[PDB]
Amino acid sequence: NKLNRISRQMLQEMGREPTPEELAERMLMPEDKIRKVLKIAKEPISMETPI
Amino acid sequence: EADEAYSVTEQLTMTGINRIRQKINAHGIPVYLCEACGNPIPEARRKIFPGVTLCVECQAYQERQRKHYA
Amino acid sequence: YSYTEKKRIRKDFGKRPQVLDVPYLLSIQLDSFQKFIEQDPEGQYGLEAAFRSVFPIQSYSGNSELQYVSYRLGEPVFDVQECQIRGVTYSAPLRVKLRLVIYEREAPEGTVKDIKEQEVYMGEIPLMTDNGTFVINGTERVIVSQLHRSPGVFFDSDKGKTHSSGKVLYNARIIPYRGSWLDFEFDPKDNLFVRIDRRRKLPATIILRALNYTTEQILDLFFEKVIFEIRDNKLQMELVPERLRGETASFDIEANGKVYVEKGRRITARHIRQLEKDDVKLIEVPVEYIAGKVVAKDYIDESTGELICAANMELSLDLLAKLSQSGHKRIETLFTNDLDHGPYISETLRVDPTNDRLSALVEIYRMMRPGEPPTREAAESLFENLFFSEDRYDLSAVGRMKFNRSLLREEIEGSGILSKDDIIDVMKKLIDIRNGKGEVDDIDHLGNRRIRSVGEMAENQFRVGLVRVERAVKERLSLGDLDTLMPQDMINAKPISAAVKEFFGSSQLSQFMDQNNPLSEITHKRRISALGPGGLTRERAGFEVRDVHPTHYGRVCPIETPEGPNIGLINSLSVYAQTNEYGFLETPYRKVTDGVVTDEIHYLSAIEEGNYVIAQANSNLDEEGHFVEDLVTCRSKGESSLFSRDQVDYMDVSTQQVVSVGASLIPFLEHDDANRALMGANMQRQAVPTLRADKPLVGTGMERAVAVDSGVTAVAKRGGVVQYVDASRIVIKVNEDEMYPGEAGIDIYNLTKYTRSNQNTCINQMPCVSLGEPVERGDVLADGPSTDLGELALGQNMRVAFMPWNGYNFEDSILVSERVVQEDRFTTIHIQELACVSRDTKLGPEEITADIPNVGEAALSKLDESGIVYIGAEVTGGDILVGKVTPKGETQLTPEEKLLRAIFGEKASDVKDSSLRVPNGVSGTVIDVQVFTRDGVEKDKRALEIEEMQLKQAKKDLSEELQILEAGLFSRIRAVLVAGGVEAEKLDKLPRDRWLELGLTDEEKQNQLEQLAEQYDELKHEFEKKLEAKRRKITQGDDLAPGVLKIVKVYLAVKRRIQPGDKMAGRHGNKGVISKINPIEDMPYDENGTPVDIVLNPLGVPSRMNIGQILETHLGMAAKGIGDKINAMLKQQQEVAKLREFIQRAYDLGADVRQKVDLSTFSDEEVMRLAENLRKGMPIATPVFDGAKEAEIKELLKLGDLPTSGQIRLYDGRTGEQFERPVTVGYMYMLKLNHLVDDKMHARSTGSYSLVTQQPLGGKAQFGGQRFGEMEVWALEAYGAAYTLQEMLTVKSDDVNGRTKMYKNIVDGNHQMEPGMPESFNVLLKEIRSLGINIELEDE
Ligand SMILES: [Zn+2]
């Protein structure tokens, strides 16, 4: 949850969005874990998705 | 391939025109009284159309009426 | 005559003069977008327009309003080239100024404070290229202009098939630009209905009650009043002397002391002439005629105050007495006549369940949203928002125009939403047509079809972008604190940029540019579609809209349309067509005033054109420009016939204006069956660009327009002389006239070199001028692919001869001499992009290291220390392009593998082999390697070498600019210093950098030297920043996806020759697949010994009535003849005299043409260069309908000293003996289309299998086996092929157990099958069994 919010204030603030190592600084933890976090944080995709 | 498409068109066109063509028949000969209403048939219609049975008045009218219901 | 015309001049047949030369072919795409993104200080469509609609946004009446100031477009983040390689979208940041005002409580309005927040960012919006494409992810895309039904109201039929009665029906539809549909329709009972959107049908009068109309006003509005007087005792009636027409007398109708007509005689012209002329106002009547009449208004009893009769209630002989004795003198009734004014609206009221305003407003609310309760506030608001809200409804200006147009109003602009009047007036007009006065529209007419294109459609996607941000802004402005939040806090970026990114990314109208061919690009950007958003659907309509409509003349091409499931659903834009001010389709014509043909041109929209009488393209006018004949074939109101000399109001501009760019490129089109012509301009675009840009011997004249207007070529910005010519770049020293005062300098054109297209063809520019040659503005500076010398050359013409060759051209198959493949001339260069990805898997990270388990040095030769293939290495199938390994530890190998590892000592590795290797069968040269690395992961060795090399090259490029631009600029300083201080030799001794000091005496020349200084120091500094940014962009972390560490893209240049299987075709719809490639020894030759390149079948020509391919062949034959003549005289070195005498004769030919020519061209240095360019053959032009005629062809055959027959005798190269009969030989421009065989050919023994269904599946591009569908099963069922079928859908596919049991048997040399049960059926049993169903296999 914290991660969606940091990107908001910094969405328009940084013209685009903060780099994957920028929100890492905003957040308290090891900050490379963002990748690790962001990977499982995704929901799986509907296998019956039309291509 | 594709050639058949052209072929298809020709057969269709021919059939439509032919029906139309027939609707005029050929060497006919007869009287002059209109079958609907007896009005005078001029020899012009007799000689343009061999076997005419409808006066110019009726040869519109009916045509006209068909159009209206369309 | 110009400069790149002086080089080579196409001999032009065709008599009709060009009065208007072909405009920019990409006009449509470029124009429309320029309008969308641009400051327009007013409302005309654009970003300004979209804003001004939704804005100003205001909080929930809290008097906290957010208004819109103006907007800006930031510079492109990457330019065109840059944005493509990396894979970003080519976009600009949209910065819009917003002003937040707050009103006091409670306020006679005015502000405590307003913060005027500078330009908040709301996403980046894509930008259009110089050549009319977009870049979405480094991939060029086109936005197809769309054709949809014009906004407005249109009255239609639905005759016949309805109900099987005939009768016909009539319906009206109000179609606004945005907001809900308003449909009005009849039925057999002649009841008027309305349905919003496509929803539940409802009785039409309900909307009047929603507009606060009670029963009385509906009668008053749609009906007349028949006033009934009670004068003395029992009933008089007001009689309109006209009312009785289309009816028979109802009683003894008498007035004025004279009985005009008695009961039972129909009121005709006699009776109405009498009444009108005799002025019959009042007549006495019986009390029984109101037995049917409907009373108009409400009448209540003055004493008891009770309702006697409600409005729209029919009186009776007893009902009259109740309101007659109450003292009522008037009773207003309806005039009902089933021929003229039908009792239609009356019947509708009797079907309406509502009565008052809120009664109807509920029935509307409950229809739109059933299931939930109606409310007073809900029902009233819903209706006011549907057709009367500026926000939720708009017809636009065009909608308002066609609305007013179709309704016979005067205003051409007015309300943007519907009014109580608007809706009523439409219902009125609909009734008129059902009465027999008026006709219906048809969807197909191009005055009722409108064209939208990119500029408009992006506007609409931006508008929806704001309405979903507007809800959010209004929501924040409700609770927003005092002077803390500002207009950026509320407006998010993603919501705006997503609503626009959605469109350009995935849409039926945003597609990959069809780019194998400058014609393919230009024919795509000029394209129409009636499909997709807001248009028709393939399953909807319906042959009428697909068919070619008369209004298509000069707007839409009749012949260039796709040949597939959507024929006529696409079409292609005609050459001279342009989009109307209102957005309709108009075409150019010539104003015929009285009997003279002017040259002042007028653009007439589809509606405008019908009225006038337009002459024909091929019409002879001479001297002043009178029509030669007293009667000329013309077309006026939808038909075509002969017309009087001075009745014609206009005339066709060109013989060409009816076709498309594709269609106009076919020579002798007039002689080609329309069907095959379609295939021609359909396949012409599929022409893959050739190795050597040829040129059509047989042309039409358009090829120069298509080459230039398509971006593929490099066209001179400003006229001047060439300073430097490189295969890389071209520098133009500008002439003084065109050269701007400051910055001086030169135009420098950097050329596009060998690079991948969208369809894997190669797009490469080459210089077509030489050092120090004069070029003028708008000259051809460099040819693209499949363009020569400025002309569009989609292929290569060759010597073609029609005859059976032992069956090697049986159907449309083609037979080709070896000389072609030896000459590498239909050889075609393709560029594939293959990429390698280092990912992150659960087990660990992938490394791009060159340490690969169980591979020899034979592999690692083409690989560098880092693991990437070297640039320049010619590799074939199997060679490794990028070494890669994925973490897979503890394999858990088996005994016999373990024993094997122990015998031969392999250190069974803990890493898998995942390297990118070259696909089997394709083979080419590596020409480029890119490496994209995550920001913050260390660039490996080779990656760092590259980003170092990109740096050294970029520094050289930028400095080359400055060196040429300095010397170009300093060279101008030298010349102005000479004007009042000329020290020619003294000046250029000292250092050139030490020149800026020299001044000048009192004059503007002192102020002119001042100008060059500014722009020098600016070159000095603009160089610096242009070099700086360039350097940062290289080293900056290339940003990738989640899970991915670094990516290597290798670009291959495969050079594919031509082999049996390739599809080839001429421009006349003659397809054919090269069948055998023959030795030159075996080719048909003539008595001069020269073999023939292609042997075509004569049978392909009569059936498919494409006779232009023959004319092309003959004219081509004559065109090579002139070539063979000049080649001999040029080798004879005869001298200018003998040469020029012969050339001059060719360009006249017979008399009456349009060509004109020399001897103006400087009778030596210029004339000789031309002769050279013609010796390969003389380029001729056959305009589309202005083409060459047999006589001109035969005449040009005489000059070439070739037979008029077009035929010669030939000799079989094998037996050497003569061929009976003359055969035709000649030159036909022929294309190789990119259905090249070694792309189609697939095969699979055993491959990948799908997880869900154990079924052959394409995974490593060793593609899935062929699909064996239902029909192929009936094939085997019709034979006895019982086993062939079982094996087909058991072991060959579905049988997870059987397939391996078989393969093992196959190699053991036992052809058997141990089938068992397909997993496809095994899953059904489980899938059924997992429902409540017990499905078993019984018995034994
Ligand atoms: Zn008659």
Q: Assign 3-class secondary structure to C755-783.
A: EECCCCEEECCEECCCCCCEECCCCEEEE
Check if the beta carbon of residue C532 is closer than 8 Å to that of residue C146. yes
For the beta carbon of residue A46, count every other beta carbon within 10 angstroms.
7
Check if the beta carbon of residue C819 is closer than 8 Å to that of residue C799. no
Q: What are phi and psi of C123, to 5 degrees?
A: 60, 170
Check if the beta carbon of residue C1054 is closer than 8 Å to that of residue C1064. no
Instruction: Locate the DSSP E strands across C477-616.
Output: 510-512, 528-529, 578-579, 585-593, 596-605
- DSSP class of residue C552? G
Check if the beta carbon of residue C709 is closer than 8 Å to that of residue C25. yes
How many beta-carbon contacts under 8 Å exist across A and C? 23
The span from the CA of C1043 to the CA of C838, in Å, is: 9
C1105–B2 C-beta distance less than 8 A = no
Amino acid at C1294: D
- DSSP class of residue C1037? P
Gyration radius of chain B's alpha carbons: 18
C967: which 2 tokens? Answer: 């010397």
Amino acid at C1101: V
Q: What are phi and psi of C790, to 5 degrees?
A: 100, -10
Check if the beta carbon of residue C590 is closer than 8 Å to that of residue C601. yes
The span from the CA of C175 to the CA of C449, in Å, is: 13
The span from the CA of C202 to the CA of C351, in Å, is: 9
This structure's resolution (Å) is 3.8
Q: Which residues of C touch A31 (CB under 8 A)?
A: none
Amino acid at C855: V
Check if the beta carbon of residue C789 is closer than 8 Å to that of residue C781. no
Method used to solve the structure? X-ray
C998-1001 CB contacts, 8 Å cutoff, 24+ apart:
none
> Domain of C838?
828-946+1045-1056
Check if the beta carbon of residue C1059 is closer than 8 Å to that of residue C1077. yes
The span from the CA of C1074 to the CA of C1079, in Å, is: 14
Distances (CA, A) of C1333 to C1273, C1326, C1330, C1339, C1340: 29, 10, 7, 19, 21
Check if the beta carbon of residue C449 is closer than 8 Å to that of residue C79. no
Q: Is the dihedral of CA C494, C80, C933, C762 positive or negative?
A: positive
> How far is the centre of ligand 1, averaged over its atoms, from the C-alpha of B64 (Å)?
14
B2–C679 C-beta distance less than 8 A = yes
SS3 at position C1110: helix
Residues 6+ apart with CB under 8 A from A50: none
Give the CB-side neighbour count of residue C335, counting CA atoms within 13 A: 22
The span from the CA of C1051 to the CA of C446, in Å, is: 47
- How many helices (H) and strands (E) chain B has is answered by 3, 0
B70–C676 C-beta distance less than 8 A = no
Residues 6+ apart with CB under 8 A from C767: C725, C726, C727, C730, C751, C781, C782
Distances (CA, A) of C582 to C20, C29, C31, C296, C892: 23, 17, 15, 44, 75
C730: which 2 tokens? Answer: 């071209």
In our burial notation (b when 16+ CB lie closer than 10 A, e otherwise), range C1173-1212 reads: bbbbbbbbbbbbbbbbbeebbbbbbebbebeeebbbebbe
What is the three-state SS of C626-681? EECCCEEEEECCCCEEEEECCCCCEEECCCCCCCEHHHHCCCCHHHECHHHHHHHH
What is the three-state SS of C8-22? CCCEECCCCCCCCCC
The span from the CA of C747 to the CA of C720, in Å, is: 9
Cβ-in-10-Å burial (0-12, 13-18, 19+) of C200 comes to: exposed
The span from the CA of C1055 to the CA of C634, in Å, is: 54
> How far is the centre of ligand 1, averaged over its atoms, from the C-alpha of C340 (Å)?
29
- DSSP class of residue C687? B
Outline where C869-922 has alpha helix (H).
Answer: 895-904
C675–B2 C-beta distance less than 8 A = yes
Distances (CA, A) of C488 to B3, C117, C720, C916: 64, 8, 51, 47
The alpha carbon of residue C993 and the mean position of all alpha carbons in its chain are separated, in whole angstroms, by: 53
The C-alpha of A3 sits at a distance from chain C's nearest C-alpha, in angstroms, of 15
The residue written with tokens 């995935």 in the block is C506
Check if the beta carbon of residue C142 is closer than 8 Å to that of residue C129. no
Distances (CA, A) of C1245 to C120, C1235, C1282: 61, 24, 22
C1293: which 2 tokens? Answer: 């596919």
The span from the CA of C1248 to the CA of C943, in Å, is: 34
The C-alpha of B57 sits at a distance from chain C's nearest C-alpha, in angstroms, of 22
The span from the CA of C395 to the CA of C418, in Å, is: 8
Distances (CA, A) of C107 to C104, C274, C770: 5, 71, 77
Amino acid at B26: A
Q: Which residues of C touch A20 (CB under 8 A)?
A: 935
**C–B contact: 3+ Cβ pairs < 8 A:** yes
Between C454-479 and C27-36, two packed helices, what is the crossing angle to 10 degrees? 20
Q: Which residues of C touch B68 (CB under 8 A)?
A: none
Q: Which residues of B touch C159 (CB under 8 A)?
A: 70
Nearest CA in chain C to A48: C1252
What's the CA angle centered on C26, arms C21 and C29, to 5 degrees? 140
Q: Which residues pair with C579 in a beta bridge?
A: C585
| Option in C493, C935, C1042 nearest A12 (CB) | C493
C231: which 2 tokens? Answer: 């004068």
Outline where C1036-1135 has alpha helix (H).
Answer: 1100-1103, 1108-1131
C1103–B2 C-beta distance less than 8 A = no
The span from the CA of C1035 to the CA of C1105, in Å, is: 62
Interface with B, mutate which of C157, C167, C168, C675 (most B CBs under 10 A): C675
Cβ-in-10-Å burial (0-12, 13-18, 19+) of A40 comes to: exposed
Cβ-in-10-Å burial (0-12, 13-18, 19+) of C115 comes to: middle
B69–C1104 C-beta distance less than 8 A = no
Check if the beta carbon of residue C679 is closer than 8 Å to that of residue C562. no
Q: State the total domains in chain B.
A: 1
A38–C493 C-beta distance less than 8 A = no
The span from the CA of C59 to the CA of C1267, in Å, is: 61
The kind and range of the H/E element at C1299 are helix C1296-1308
- Percent helix, strand and coil across chain B, each to the nearest 5: 55, 5, 40
Check if the beta carbon of residue C880 is closer than 8 Å to that of residue C862. yes
Outline where C279-356 has alpha helix (H).
Answer: 317-324, 344-349
Q: Which residues of B touch C1105 (CB under 8 A)?
A: 6
Q: C8, C12, C2: which is closest to C1152 by C-alpha?
A: C12
Q: Which residues pair with C12 in a beta bridge?
A: C1181
Distances (CA, A) of C176 to C395, C633, C1320: 4, 41, 51
Residues in chain C: 1340
> How far is the centre of ligand 1, averaged over its atoms, from the C-alpha of C272 (Å)?
30
- DSSP class of residue C688? P
Greatest alpha-carbon span in chain B: 57
- DSSP class of residue C1233? B
In our burial notation (b when 16+ CB lie closer than 10 A, e otherwise), range C356-389 reads: ebbebbbbbbeebeeeeeeeeeebbebbeebbbe
In our burial notation (b when 16+ CB lie closer than 10 A, e otherwise), range A20-32 reads: beebbebeeeeee
Distances (CA, A) of C443 to C452, C568, C911: 16, 14, 66
Distances (CA, A) of C1076 to A50, C551, C814, C1072, C1216: 43, 47, 8, 12, 20
The span from the CA of C572 to the CA of C583, in Å, is: 17
Check if the beta carbon of residue C962 is closer than 8 Å to that of residue C956. no
Output the domain CATH number for residue A9: 1.10.10.10
The span from the CA of C510 to the CA of C78, in Å, is: 21
Residues of C with CB under 8 A from a CB of A: 93, 120-121, 488, 491-494, 840, 935-936, 1042-1043, 1252
Residues 6+ apart with CB under 8 A from A43: none
Residues of C with CB under 8 A from a CB of B: 159, 166, 168, 563, 673, 675-676, 679, 1069, 1103-1105
| C867 conformational bin, left if phi > 0, alpha if psi -120 to 50, beta if neither | left
> Domain of A5?
1-51
Cβ-in-10-Å burial (0-12, 13-18, 19+) of C125 comes to: buried
A21–C493 C-beta distance less than 8 A = no
B2–C1104 C-beta distance less than 8 A = yes
Check if the beta carbon of residue C646 is closer than 8 Å to that of residue C577. no
Q: C604, C642, C646: which is closest to C625 by C-alpha?
A: C646
A39–C1043 C-beta distance less than 8 A = yes
C586: which 2 tokens? Answer: 């108009």
Torsion (CA) C799, C802, C807, C809 in degrees, nearest 10:
70
Q: C244, C234, C219, C239: which is closest to C288 by C-alpha?
A: C234
Nearest CA in chain C to B1: C1104
The span from the CA of C325 to the CA of C340, in Å, is: 35
> How far is the centre of ligand 1, averaged over its atoms, from the C-alpha of C246 (Å)?
26
C166–B6 C-beta distance less than 8 A = no
Q: C789, C777, C707: which is closest to C749 by C-alpha?
A: C777
For the beta carbon of residue C428, count every other beta carbon within 10 angstroms.
12
Residues 6+ apart with CB under 8 A from C322: C308
Q: Is the dihedral of CA C160, C161, C165, C167 positive or negative?
A: negative
For the beta carbon of residue C697, count every other beta carbon within 10 angstroms.
27
Residues of B with CB under 8 A from a CB of C: 2-3, 5-6, 69-70
What is the three-state SS of C206-218? HHHHHCCCCHHHH
In our burial notation (b when 16+ CB lie closer than 10 A, e otherwise), range C1131-1162 reads: eeeeeeeebbebbeebeebeeebeeeebeebe
Q: C613, C652, C616, C587: which is closest to C447 by C-alpha?
A: C587
Q: C1051, C751, C851: which is closest to C931 by C-alpha?
A: C1051
A12–C488 C-beta distance less than 8 A = yes
- Is it true that the peptide bond before C562 is cis, omega within 30 degrees of 0? no
A15–C93 C-beta distance less than 8 A = yes
- DSSP class of residue C690? P
Give the CB-side neighbour count of residue C22, counting CA atoms within 13 A: 21
Q: C920, C913, C848, C836: which is closest to C878 by C-alpha?
A: C920
Q: Which residues pair with C504 in a beta bridge?
A: none
Torsion (CA) C226, C229, C230, C235 in degrees, nearest 10:
-50
The span from the CA of C251 to the CA of C779, in Å, is: 90
> How far is the centre of ligand 1, averaged over its atoms, from the C-alpha of B42 (Å)?
12
Nearest CA in chain B to C165: B69
How many beta-carbon contacts under 8 Å exist across B and C? 16
Check if the beta carbon of residue C233 is closer than 8 Å to that of residue C224. no
Between C1136-1146 and C1108-1131, two packed helices, what is the crossing angle to 10 degrees? 170
The residue written with tokens 């001059």 in the block is C1144
- Is it true that the peptide bond before C742 is cis, omega within 30 degrees of 0? no
The span from the CA of B27 to the CA of C76, in Å, is: 83
Q: C1162, C1159, C1120: which is closest to C1141 by C-alpha?
A: C1159
Output the domain CATH number for residue C866: 2.40.50.150
Residues 6+ apart with CB under 8 A from C524: C142, C144, C513, C514, C515, C685
| Option in B3, B69, B70 nearest C1104 (CB) | B3
For the beta carbon of residue C278, count every other beta carbon within 10 angstroms.
12
Distances (CA, A) of C209 to B43, C347, C415: 66, 16, 22
Q: Which residues of C touch B6 (CB under 8 A)?
A: 673, 675, 1104-1105
C266: which 2 tokens? Answer: 């129909």
- Is it true that the peptide bond before C860 is cis, omega within 30 degrees of 0? no
C124: which 2 tokens? Answer: 């980046």
Please report all neighbours of A, defined by 3+ CB atom pairs within 8 A: C
Amino acid at C1242: H
SS3 at position C1205: coil
> Domain of B69?
1-70
Q: Which residues of B touch C563 (CB under 8 A)?
A: 2
The C-alpha of A15 sits at a distance from chain C's nearest C-alpha, in angstroms, of 7
Check if the beta carbon of residue C509 is closer than 8 Å to that of residue C140. no
Cβ-in-10-Å burial (0-12, 13-18, 19+) of C877 comes to: exposed
Q: What are phi and psi of C1051, to 5 degrees?
A: -105, 120
C673–B2 C-beta distance less than 8 A = no
Residues 6+ apart with CB under 8 A from C465: C122, C495, C496, C497, C498, C499, C500
Residues 6+ apart with CB under 8 A from C671: C1107, C1108, C1111, C1187
SS3 at position C71: strand
